[PDB]
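My current task is to audit a protein record that another person submitted. Alongside the sequence sits a line of tokens, each denoting a local backbone shape. Please read both lines and tell me whether the tokens look consistent with the sequence. Do not assume that whoever made the record got everything right. Thanks in advance; the entry in question is below.
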Amino acid sequence: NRVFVIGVGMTKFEKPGARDIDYPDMAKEAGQRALADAGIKYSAIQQACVGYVYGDSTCGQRAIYHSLGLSGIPIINVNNNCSTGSTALFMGRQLIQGGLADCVLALGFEKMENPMDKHMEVMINRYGLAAVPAAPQMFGNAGREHMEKYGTKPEHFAKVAWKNHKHSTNNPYSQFQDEYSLEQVIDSRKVFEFLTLLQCCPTSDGAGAAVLASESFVRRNGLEKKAVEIVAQEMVTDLSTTFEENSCMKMVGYDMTRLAAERCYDTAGVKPSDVDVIELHDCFSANELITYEALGLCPEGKAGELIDRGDNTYGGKWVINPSGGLISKGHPLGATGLAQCAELCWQLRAEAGPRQVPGAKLALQHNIGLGGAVVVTLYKMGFP
């Protein structure tokens, strides 16, 4: 069964406490924007898939009833107690593709609240980073491994972050919308090793939403115009390996990204060179830089050359994170994938305004599930 995104919506992503509304009003703003975009009656929604990390099991229902009114529809919380949760969009795609529903709402939101692990926990709190204590150490280790094997420079990681902040200047939904100089990225507060504060994603509070529909729902309702097809979607969980084969890059999911993308390319019958625009999970600059190679944009060890050619921005081969990435937008855990989806749908619909990638036809999304698995998605217009 083919699956289409027929409406998208999001709140602005803002510093926690910047905006004095609670998570149900954030959900309502994003959800009602997606339903207005879709152009459907609220009663068309048959099930809701709701992604959030903080708060008890009733928050998904509370947010949906505040957004749509009271109803009997299933309300599925993405983040189950197995800690193997995917994403609201991934689950909504499953329900359509599996013939369990014709039309679903995917909703996501977040409203915050050894000695090195203790130091990183305090740093995360005081710097407002959207990371767990292990993450800066694991991503710094992966970055350092890439430098030692391939000759990548610390400045290549800073240039990735610089490019994301530059893109953010045209995204009114992003927490940060200012261009920093490369020297300012390098000179910002140390987080871990070469990673500085402007290379790490901050916390944001916010919400995002998407309306997903079957081919028959799109046809019956005449909604071909805005229908963005999910032409491939793959999740890959931790790949059990040996001591001899393990590496710092594998420990942060390099091969999970690589296999998810390979499977998407095969399903969609496309190559990395066919992709026009990308939104990826730049939790740290180091994740974006190695993800260039995992996605097959360039050969092993060649990300520094891609960066130095400007082949990750406007006028280059790929426009990567036209949104400004997690580095600029910040990272409300449950909402990040739906914000990526909103931007890629606007790009393919030619509605991304000052961020528009001219002629974009194939979009790739890279994201991490609430349980840590990598999800890669490919999008094209359904009815061009």
